[PDB]
Design a protein around this ligand. Structure first.
Ligand SMILES: [Cu+]
Length: 75
């Protein structure tokens, strides 16, 4: 219970192809309520249910796509 959002700076992902790579690849794992990623600040925000899946798992998941994630939550 209780939602959550976290932003990770995803170094490597930096064109529309990479955007849709992350976004589409994310929108399938349980926990993910909403993804979106933006290249302007090379950020990915994953609105994951902060219970069943953790920042670790998101890190590994994004790493599997070939871009380096590190949690920040800027805004
Ligand atoms: Cu790209």
């Amino acid at each position: 219970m209780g939602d959550g959002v976290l932003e990770l700076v995803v170094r490597g992902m930096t064109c529309a192809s990479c955007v849709h790579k992350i976004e589409s690849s994310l929108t399938k794992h349980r926990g993910i309520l909403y993804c979106s990623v933006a290249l302007a600040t090379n950020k990915a925000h994953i609105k994951y249910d902060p219970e069943i899946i953790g920042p670790r798992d998101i890190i590994h998941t994004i790493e599997s796509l070939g871009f380096e994630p590190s949690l920040v939550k800027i805004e």
